[PDB]
PDB file of C-alpha atoms in Angstrom:
ATOM      1  CA  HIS A   1       0.000   0.000   0.000  1.00 41.35           C
ATOM      2  CA  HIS A   2       2.642   2.486   1.129  1.00 39.34           C
ATOM      3  CA  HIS A   3       4.949   1.494  -1.738  1.00 39.95           C
ATOM      4  CA  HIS A   4       2.279   1.863  -4.414  1.00 38.71           C
ATOM      5  CA  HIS A   5       1.388   5.352  -3.222  1.00 41.55           C
ATOM      6  CA  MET A   6       5.039   6.490  -2.888  1.00 38.45           C
ATOM      7  CA  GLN A   7       5.570   5.194  -6.415  1.00 37.42           C
ATOM      8  CA  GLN A   8       2.663   7.296  -7.675  1.00 34.48           C
ATOM      9  CA  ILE A   9       4.039  10.330  -5.809  1.00 34.70           C
ATOM     10  CA  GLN A  10       7.441   9.897  -7.450  1.00 34.45           C
ATOM     11  CA  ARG A  11       5.889   9.552 -10.898  1.00 34.53           C
ATOM     12  CA  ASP A  12       3.699  12.634 -10.462  1.00 37.53           C
ATOM     13  CA  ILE A  13       6.731  14.698  -9.274  1.00 33.77           C
ATOM     14  CA  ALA A  14       8.805  13.558 -12.253  1.00 32.82           C
ATOM     15  CA  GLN A  15       5.923  14.523 -14.604  1.00 31.91           C
ATOM     16  CA  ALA A  16       5.477  17.949 -12.940  1.00 33.86           C
ATOM     17  CA  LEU A  17       9.204  18.614 -13.417  1.00 32.29           C
ATOM     18  CA  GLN A  18       9.171  17.200 -16.973  1.00 35.02           C
ATOM     19  CA  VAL A  19      12.041  14.900 -16.060  1.00 37.19           C
ATOM     20  CA  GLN A  20      14.015  13.780 -19.109  1.00 39.17           C
ATOM     21  CA  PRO A  21      14.181   9.997 -19.486  1.00 40.36           C
ATOM     22  CA  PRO A  22      17.702   8.596 -18.887  1.00 42.16           C
ATOM     23  CA  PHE A  23      19.919   8.894 -21.975  1.00 40.20           C
ATOM     24  CA  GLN A  24      20.062   5.470 -23.688  1.00 42.26           C
ATOM     25  CA  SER A  25      22.304   6.438 -26.578  1.00 43.17           C
ATOM     26  CA  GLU A  26      24.493   9.130 -28.066  1.00 41.39           C
ATOM     27  CA  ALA A  27      21.499   9.921 -30.291  1.00 39.40           C
ATOM     28  CA  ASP A  28      19.605  10.901 -27.132  1.00 41.40           C
ATOM     29  CA  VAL A  29      22.383  13.237 -25.928  1.00 39.21           C
ATOM     30  CA  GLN A  30      22.810  14.979 -29.279  1.00 43.57           C
ATOM     31  CA  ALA A  31      19.039  15.321 -29.679  1.00 42.25           C
ATOM     32  CA  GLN A  32      18.808  17.104 -26.350  1.00 42.78           C
ATOM     33  CA  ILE A  33      21.564  19.551 -27.238  1.00 40.91           C
ATOM     34  CA  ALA A  34      19.888  20.298 -30.558  1.00 40.39           C
ATOM     35  CA  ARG A  35      16.456  20.702 -28.944  1.00 41.08           C
ATOM     36  CA  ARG A  36      17.649  23.064 -26.237  1.00 43.99           C
ATOM     37  CA  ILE A  37      19.670  25.169 -28.643  1.00 40.82           C
ATOM     38  CA  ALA A  38      16.568  25.435 -30.871  1.00 38.87           C
ATOM     39  CA  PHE A  39      14.481  26.348 -27.802  1.00 38.11           C
ATOM     40  CA  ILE A  40      16.890  29.209 -26.926  1.00 40.53           C
ATOM     41  CA  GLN A  41      16.733  30.497 -30.531  1.00 40.16           C
ATOM     42  CA  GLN A  42      12.945  30.276 -30.564  1.00 38.57           C
ATOM     43  CA  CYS A  43      12.721  32.358 -27.367  1.00 38.91           C
ATOM     44  CA  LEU A  44      14.794  35.118 -29.017  1.00 37.77           C
ATOM     45  CA  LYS A  45      12.726  35.037 -32.212  1.00 38.19           C
ATOM     46  CA  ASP A  46       9.416  35.034 -30.345  1.00 34.63           C
ATOM     47  CA  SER A  47      10.511  37.988 -28.199  1.00 33.90           C
ATOM     48  CA  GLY A  48      11.966  39.830 -31.189  1.00 33.94           C
ATOM     49  CA  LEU A  49      15.247  40.178 -29.222  1.00 34.60           C
ATOM     50  CA  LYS A  50      18.848  39.438 -30.134  1.00 33.14           C
ATOM     51  CA  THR A  51      20.838  39.268 -26.880  1.00 32.40           C
ATOM     52  CA  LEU A  52      21.235  36.526 -24.171  1.00 32.88           C
ATOM     53  CA  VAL A  53      22.515  37.233 -20.658  1.00 29.63           C
ATOM     54  CA  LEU A  54      23.804  34.688 -18.125  1.00 31.21           C
ATOM     55  CA  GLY A  55      25.798  34.885 -14.877  1.00 32.11           C
ATOM     56  CA  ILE A  56      28.789  32.513 -15.038  1.00 33.05           C
ATOM     57  CA  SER A  57      29.536  31.354 -11.516  1.00 32.58           C
ATOM     58  CA  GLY A  58      32.096  28.652 -12.195  1.00 32.75           C
ATOM     59  CA  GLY A  59      29.584  25.857 -11.587  1.00 34.07           C
ATOM     60  CA  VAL A  60      28.680  23.181 -14.151  1.00 38.80           C
ATOM     61  CA  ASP A  61      25.063  24.337 -14.589  1.00 40.86           C
ATOM     62  CA  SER A  62      25.885  27.849 -15.804  1.00 37.44           C
ATOM     63  CA  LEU A  63      28.812  26.401 -17.779  1.00 38.88           C
ATOM     64  CA  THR A  64      26.387  24.110 -19.642  1.00 36.84           C
ATOM     65  CA  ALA A  65      23.751  26.777 -20.166  1.00 40.35           C
ATOM     66  CA  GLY A  66      26.504  29.174 -21.298  1.00 42.12           C
ATOM     67  CA  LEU A  67      27.804  26.692 -23.879  1.00 43.99           C
ATOM     68  CA  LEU A  68      24.284  26.176 -25.212  1.00 41.52           C
ATOM     69  CA  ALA A  69      23.755  29.989 -25.391  1.00 43.52           C
ATOM     70  CA  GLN A  70      27.036  30.680 -27.216  1.00 44.18           C
ATOM     71  CA  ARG A  71      26.355  27.938 -29.792  1.00 44.45           C
ATOM     72  CA  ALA A  72      22.765  29.234 -30.210  1.00 44.14           C
ATOM     73  CA  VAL A  73      23.842  32.785 -31.154  1.00 43.84           C
ATOM     74  CA  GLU A  74      26.750  31.615 -33.338  1.00 43.14           C
ATOM     75  CA  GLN A  75      24.235  29.577 -35.344  1.00 43.97           C
ATOM     76  CA  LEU A  76      21.788  32.468 -35.519  1.00 45.17           C
ATOM     77  CA  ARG A  77      24.460  34.822 -36.823  1.00 44.13           C
ATOM     78  CA  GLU A  78      25.491  32.296 -39.468  1.00 44.53           C
ATOM     79  CA  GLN A  79      21.915  31.581 -40.602  1.00 44.64           C
ATOM     80  CA  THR A  80      20.463  35.069 -40.422  1.00 47.18           C
ATOM     81  CA  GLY A  81      23.523  37.161 -41.190  1.00 50.02           C
ATOM     82  CA  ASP A  82      22.408  39.397 -38.302  1.00 52.19           C
ATOM     83  CA  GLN A  83      25.499  40.299 -36.299  1.00 52.82           C
ATOM     84  CA  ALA A  84      23.396  41.776 -33.448  1.00 53.73           C
ATOM     85  CA  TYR A  85      22.816  38.269 -32.016  1.00 51.51           C
ATOM     86  CA  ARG A  86      25.095  38.136 -28.969  1.00 53.56           C
ATOM     87  CA  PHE A  87      25.697  36.195 -25.773  1.00 53.23           C
ATOM     88  CA  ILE A  88      26.826  38.271 -22.808  1.00 49.90           C
ATOM     89  CA  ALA A  89      28.442  36.263 -20.045  1.00 45.94           C
ATOM     90  CA  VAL A  90      28.375  38.047 -16.691  1.00 42.88           C
ATOM     91  CA  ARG A  91      31.034  37.616 -14.022  1.00 42.13           C
ATOM     92  CA  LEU A  92      29.629  38.258 -10.562  1.00 43.17           C
ATOM     93  CA  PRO A  93      32.761  38.042  -8.354  1.00 42.11           C
ATOM     94  CA  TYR A  94      32.770  37.075  -4.719  1.00 41.69           C
ATOM     95  CA  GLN A  95      35.388  35.652  -2.361  1.00 42.92           C
ATOM     96  CA  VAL A  96      35.432  31.877  -2.844  1.00 44.09           C
ATOM     97  CA  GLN A  97      38.874  31.095  -4.284  1.00 46.47           C
ATOM     98  CA  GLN A  98      37.968  27.854  -6.073  1.00 44.31           C
ATOM     99  CA  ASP A  99      34.788  29.417  -7.412  1.00 43.20           C
ATOM    100  CA  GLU A 100      36.600  32.354  -9.021  1.00 45.15           C
ATOM    101  CA  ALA A 101      39.250  30.047 -10.486  1.00 48.19           C
ATOM    102  CA  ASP A 102      36.425  27.841 -11.723  1.00 46.37           C
ATOM    103  CA  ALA A 103      34.622  30.941 -13.054  1.00 47.07           C
ATOM    104  CA  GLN A 104      37.672  32.007 -15.052  1.00 46.40           C
ATOM    105  CA  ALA A 105      38.137  28.459 -16.334  1.00 47.91           C
ATOM    106  CA  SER A 106      34.421  28.396 -17.221  1.00 46.69           C
ATOM    107  CA  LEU A 107      34.670  31.650 -19.161  1.00 44.94           C
ATOM    108  CA  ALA A 108      37.699  30.273 -20.970  1.00 43.75           C
ATOM    109  CA  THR A 109      35.634  27.221 -21.949  1.00 44.97           C
ATOM    110  CA  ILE A 110      32.606  29.173 -23.212  1.00 45.57           C
ATOM    111  CA  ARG A 111      34.475  31.882 -25.174  1.00 45.24           C
ATOM    112  CA  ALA A 112      31.353  34.054 -24.926  1.00 48.16           C
ATOM    113  CA  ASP A 113      30.914  36.815 -27.437  1.00 44.62           C
ATOM    114  CA  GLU A 114      31.098  39.341 -24.625  1.00 43.33           C
ATOM    115  CA  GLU A 115      32.042  39.317 -20.932  1.00 41.78           C
ATOM    116  CA  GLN A 116      30.921  41.884 -18.363  1.00 40.34           C
ATOM    117  CA  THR A 117      31.901  42.083 -14.684  1.00 39.68           C
ATOM    118  CA  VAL A 118      29.521  43.360 -12.031  1.00 41.46           C
ATOM    119  CA  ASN A 119      30.643  43.696  -8.454  1.00 42.39           C
ATOM    120  CA  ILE A 120      27.397  43.606  -6.496  1.00 44.30           C
ATOM    121  CA  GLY A 121      29.229  44.114  -3.191  1.00 45.71           C
ATOM    122  CA  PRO A 122      28.584  47.868  -2.924  1.00 45.88           C
ATOM    123  CA  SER A 123      24.892  47.489  -3.770  1.00 44.62           C
ATOM    124  CA  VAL A 124      24.365  44.623  -1.283  1.00 47.99           C
ATOM    125  CA  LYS A 125      26.200  46.521   1.467  1.00 45.97           C
ATOM    126  CA  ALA A 126      24.306  49.753   0.755  1.00 46.96           C
ATOM    127  CA  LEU A 127      20.925  47.967   0.938  1.00 44.32           C
ATOM    128  CA  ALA A 128      21.925  46.106   4.134  1.00 40.75           C
ATOM    129  CA  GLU A 129      22.832  49.324   5.818  1.00 43.88           C
ATOM    130  CA  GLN A 130      19.292  50.693   5.270  1.00 49.56           C
ATOM    131  CA  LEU A 131      17.446  47.614   6.632  1.00 50.05           C
ATOM    132  CA  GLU A 132      16.678  48.104  10.312  1.00 48.44           C
ATOM    133  CA  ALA A 133      15.251  44.567  10.237  1.00 48.78           C
ATOM    134  CA  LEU A 134      18.821  43.200   9.989  1.00 50.32           C
ATOM    135  CA  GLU A 135      19.692  44.756  13.320  1.00 50.62           C
ATOM    136  CA  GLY A 136      19.983  42.223  16.119  1.00 47.32           C
ATOM    137  CA  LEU A 137      19.448  39.141  13.961  1.00 48.12           C
ATOM    138  CA  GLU A 138      21.125  35.956  15.090  1.00 46.01           C
ATOM    139  CA  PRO A 139      24.269  35.386  13.022  1.00 45.94           C
ATOM    140  CA  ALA A 140      23.100  32.244  11.182  1.00 50.43           C
ATOM    141  CA  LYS A 141      19.826  33.953  10.213  1.00 50.72           C
ATOM    142  CA  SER A 142      21.648  37.180   9.257  1.00 52.11           C
ATOM    143  CA  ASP A 143      24.044  35.317   6.964  1.00 51.10           C
ATOM    144  CA  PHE A 144      21.080  33.530   5.337  1.00 49.62           C
ATOM    145  CA  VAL A 145      19.099  36.736   4.787  1.00 50.19           C
ATOM    146  CA  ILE A 146      22.195  38.544   3.445  1.00 51.56           C
ATOM    147  CA  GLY A 147      22.937  35.535   1.199  1.00 51.33           C
ATOM    148  CA  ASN A 148      19.522  35.862  -0.368  1.00 50.96           C
ATOM    149  CA  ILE A 149      19.925  39.607  -0.845  1.00 51.35           C
ATOM    150  CA  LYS A 150      23.114  38.748  -2.784  1.00 52.03           C
ATOM    151  CA  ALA A 151      21.298  36.175  -4.923  1.00 54.29           C
ATOM    152  CA  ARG A 152      18.510  38.632  -5.716  1.00 52.97           C
ATOM    153  CA  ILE A 153      20.822  41.534  -6.556  1.00 57.46           C
ATOM    154  CA  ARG A 154      22.714  39.178  -8.915  1.00 58.37           C
ATOM    155  CA  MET A 155      19.302  38.752 -10.644  1.00 59.30           C
ATOM    156  CA  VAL A 156      18.765  42.522 -10.721  1.00 59.76           C
ATOM    157  CA  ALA A 157      22.199  43.031 -12.338  1.00 61.54           C
ATOM    158  CA  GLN A 158      21.529  40.477 -15.067  1.00 58.97           C
ATOM    159  CA  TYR A 159      18.092  42.004 -15.792  1.00 60.23           C
ATOM    160  CA  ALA A 160      19.646  45.500 -15.979  1.00 57.16           C
ATOM    161  CA  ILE A 161      22.159  44.243 -18.607  1.00 56.54           C
ATOM    162  CA  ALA A 162      19.383  42.524 -20.499  1.00 53.55           C
ATOM    163  CA  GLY A 163      17.231  45.665 -20.422  1.00 52.22           C
ATOM    164  CA  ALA A 164      20.141  47.792 -21.599  1.00 51.76           C
ATOM    165  CA  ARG A 165      20.983  45.444 -24.445  1.00 50.32           C
ATOM    166  CA  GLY A 166      17.537  44.152 -25.512  1.00 48.82           C
ATOM    167  CA  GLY A 167      18.103  40.709 -24.100  1.00 47.40           C
ATOM    168  CA  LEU A 168      16.631  37.644 -22.390  1.00 52.32           C
ATOM    169  CA  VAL A 169      18.023  36.372 -19.083  1.00 53.92           C
ATOM    170  CA  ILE A 170      18.963  32.672 -19.015  1.00 53.48           C
ATOM    171  CA  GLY A 171      18.480  30.707 -15.787  1.00 55.14           C
ATOM    172  CA  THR A 172      20.195  27.432 -14.912  1.00 55.35           C
ATOM    173  CA  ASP A 173      17.397  25.566 -13.150  1.00 55.92           C
ATOM    174  CA  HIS A 174      17.119  21.833 -13.870  1.00 55.38           C
ATOM    175  CA  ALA A 175      15.054  19.016 -12.335  1.00 55.91           C
ATOM    176  CA  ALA A 176      17.579  18.061  -9.596  1.00 54.98           C
ATOM    177  CA  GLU A 177      17.694  21.644  -8.369  1.00 56.21           C
ATOM    178  CA  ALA A 178      13.951  22.174  -8.820  1.00 59.55           C
ATOM    179  CA  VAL A 179      12.753  19.135  -6.889  1.00 59.80           C
ATOM    180  CA  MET A 180      14.544  20.393  -3.737  1.00 56.56           C
ATOM    181  CA  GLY A 181      13.687  24.049  -4.284  1.00 60.21           C
ATOM    182  CA  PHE A 182      17.450  24.671  -4.170  1.00 62.00           C
ATOM    183  CA  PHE A 183      17.339  28.239  -5.444  1.00 57.36           C
ATOM    184  CA  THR A 184      16.402  31.660  -4.153  1.00 56.87           C
ATOM    185  CA  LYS A 185      12.889  32.675  -4.999  1.00 57.12           C
ATOM    186  CA  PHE A 186      13.145  35.765  -7.279  1.00 54.00           C
ATOM    187  CA  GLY A 187      16.916  35.383  -7.188  1.00 54.34           C
ATOM    188  CA  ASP A 188      18.526  32.663  -9.328  1.00 53.10           C
ATOM    189  CA  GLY A 189      15.012  31.167  -9.843  1.00 52.85           C
ATOM    190  CA  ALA A 190      14.217  34.327 -11.782  1.00 50.42           C
ATOM    191  CA  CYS A 191      14.883  34.238 -15.540  1.00 51.56           C
ATOM    192  CA  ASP A 192      13.113  34.476 -18.873  1.00 50.30           C
ATOM    193  CA  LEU A 193      14.082  30.989 -20.133  1.00 50.25           C
ATOM    194  CA  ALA A 194      15.523  27.911 -18.420  1.00 48.71           C
ATOM    195  CA  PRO A 195      17.096  25.709 -21.128  1.00 49.11           C
ATOM    196  CA  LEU A 196      18.282  23.020 -18.637  1.00 49.55           C
ATOM    197  CA  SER A 197      14.745  22.431 -17.331  1.00 51.61           C
ATOM    198  CA  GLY A 198      13.882  18.783 -16.764  1.00 53.67           C
ATOM    199  CA  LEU A 199      17.482  17.549 -16.714  1.00 53.33           C
ATOM    200  CA  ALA A 200      18.832  15.372 -13.914  1.00 50.62           C
ATOM    201  CA  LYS A 201      22.219  16.552 -12.549  1.00 47.75           C
ATOM    202  CA  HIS A 202      24.110  13.726 -14.270  1.00 49.03           C
ATOM    203  CA  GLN A 203      22.380  14.736 -17.535  1.00 46.87           C
ATOM    204  CA  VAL A 204      23.555  18.322 -17.154  1.00 47.33           C
ATOM    205  CA  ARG A 205      27.091  16.939 -16.776  1.00 41.43           C
ATOM    206  CA  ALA A 206      26.607  14.709 -19.821  1.00 42.24           C
ATOM    207  CA  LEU A 207      25.628  17.711 -21.919  1.00 41.50           C
ATOM    208  CA  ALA A 208      28.580  19.750 -20.614  1.00 44.29           C
ATOM    209  CA  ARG A 209      30.972  16.941 -21.638  1.00 47.28           C
ATOM    210  CA  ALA A 210      29.383  16.647 -25.085  1.00 46.66           C
ATOM    211  CA  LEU A 211      29.577  20.448 -25.454  1.00 46.86           C
ATOM    212  CA  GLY A 212      33.357  20.414 -24.911  1.00 43.67           C
ATOM    213  CA  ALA A 213      33.798  21.259 -21.213  1.00 45.57           C
ATOM    214  CA  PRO A 214      37.014  20.018 -19.559  1.00 43.19           C
ATOM    215  CA  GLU A 215      36.468  17.097 -17.199  1.00 38.98           C
ATOM    216  CA  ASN A 216      37.469  18.991 -14.030  1.00 41.68           C
ATOM    217  CA  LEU A 217      34.658  21.480 -14.653  1.00 38.66           C
ATOM    218  CA  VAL A 218      32.133  18.792 -15.573  1.00 39.88           C
ATOM    219  CA  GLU A 219      32.699  16.986 -12.301  1.00 37.28           C
ATOM    220  CA  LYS A 220      33.190  20.226 -10.351  1.00 36.98           C
ATOM    221  CA  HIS A 221      18.903  18.563   2.487  1.00 36.73           C
ATOM    222  CA  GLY A 222      21.318  15.841   3.597  1.00 38.41           C
ATOM    223  CA  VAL A 223      20.630  14.183   0.250  1.00 40.85           C
ATOM    224  CA  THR A 224      23.050  13.735  -2.670  1.00 37.68           C
ATOM    225  CA  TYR A 225      22.630  14.512  -6.324  1.00 41.10           C
ATOM    226  CA  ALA A 226      23.021  10.804  -7.111  1.00 42.22           C
ATOM    227  CA  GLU A 227      20.069  10.167  -4.794  1.00 40.59           C
ATOM    228  CA  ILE A 228      18.017  13.023  -6.292  1.00 40.68           C
ATOM    229  CA  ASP A 229      18.633  11.769  -9.822  1.00 41.80           C
ATOM    230  CA  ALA A 230      17.695   8.188  -8.864  1.00 42.60           C
ATOM    231  CA  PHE A 231      14.465   9.515  -7.376  1.00 42.47           C
ATOM    232  CA  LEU A 232      13.702  11.579 -10.503  1.00 41.03           C
ATOM    233  CA  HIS A 233      14.278   8.585 -12.754  1.00 37.96           C
ATOM    234  CA  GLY A 234      12.330   6.157 -10.565  1.00 36.00           C
ATOM    235  CA  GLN A 235      15.438   4.082  -9.827  1.00 40.89           C
ATOM    236  CA  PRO A 236      16.219   2.409  -6.497  1.00 42.47           C
ATOM    237  CA  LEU A 237      17.374   4.638  -3.614  1.00 40.82           C
ATOM    238  CA  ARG A 238      17.300   4.642   0.147  1.00 40.30           C
ATOM    239  CA  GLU A 239      13.771   4.979   1.443  1.00 38.07           C
ATOM    240  CA  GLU A 240      14.842   7.647   3.895  1.00 40.16           C
ATOM    241  CA  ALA A 241      16.244   9.771   1.064  1.00 39.78           C
ATOM    242  CA  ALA A 242      13.048   9.433  -0.975  1.00 41.94           C
ATOM    243  CA  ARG A 243      11.164  10.638   2.111  1.00 41.97           C
ATOM    244  CA  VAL A 244      13.314  13.733   2.500  1.00 44.22           C
ATOM    245  CA  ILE A 245      13.063  14.531  -1.215  1.00 45.06           C
ATOM    246  CA  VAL A 246       9.266  14.258  -1.201  1.00 44.37           C
ATOM    247  CA  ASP A 247       8.941  16.319   2.001  1.00 44.18           C
ATOM    248  CA  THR A 248      11.256  18.980   0.602  1.00 40.81           C
ATOM    249  CA  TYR A 249       9.405  19.092  -2.698  1.00 42.87           C
ATOM    250  CA  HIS A 250       6.101  19.621  -0.927  1.00 42.56           C
ATOM    251  CA  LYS A 251       7.494  22.349   1.376  1.00 40.47           C
ATOM    252  CA  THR A 252       8.992  24.270  -1.531  1.00 37.09           C
ATOM    253  CA  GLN A 253       6.025  24.065  -3.982  1.00 37.31           C
ATOM    254  CA  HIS A 254       5.384  27.817  -3.688  1.00 36.56           C
ATOM    255  CA  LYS A 255       8.811  28.455  -5.254  1.00 40.22           C
ATOM    256  CA  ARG A 256       7.720  26.588  -8.397  1.00 40.29           C
ATOM    257  CA  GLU A 257       4.386  28.381  -8.785  1.00 37.37           C
ATOM    258  CA  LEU A 258       3.159  31.855  -9.567  1.00 33.80           C
ATOM    259  CA  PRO A 259       2.176  34.090  -6.599  1.00 34.22           C
ATOM    260  CA  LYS A 260      -0.800  32.773  -4.680  1.00 37.44           C
ATOM    261  CA  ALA A 261      -4.164  34.293  -5.518  1.00 38.65           C
ATOM    262  CA  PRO A 262      -7.656  33.912  -3.984  1.00 41.29           C
TER     263      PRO A 262
END
């Protein structure tokens, strides 16, 4: 009884997230790259816009989305002859050594048409200073609230560049991130198009490898991504992990919906 219902729950979650079936062949992998590149191009055409904007953090998700974006605009320039098609990669520096090294290495992999650097530090600090509600907060809560300010001002910076340059903002959400609600609402969850949607984490890595990323970048709630992916694909995993994934999914549903309305 319990098993049958948990099975139905897993299947309904995978359908809601449009989970991509596991890749069975190279044909599958190449088809997904082609589809997502075509999706990116179709978003530009439908919007009548020419520019793509994406923060490059150094992580594999933005590396993969960045590679798809750069290939998409290269193809559009070739086919249309319109040199205004451009991908703008955005560096949003912080103070994690490995991240910044990974970010530079990521940029070197993408070879984006254009790179811009936005230090959000001054803006985050200047907002913080005006929020009396931050005064007296316990340190763990303060760091969390300030962390989400940072994530949201990174969104604001990308949208400002897109507005300046007539662009769409790319987000890096995929099914392994989405099922756990592992993003800031109206921060990195906020974009115009999410070309990695539905992918399991190992599928994101598979695309990055097929797109030419170096191996060190490809492999760069108490639950692992291997567990999350097994859950998404309906494969065996520890019952306790399935429980945490389902409970987390339910708690975070509001992050995957529009604002509530009566």
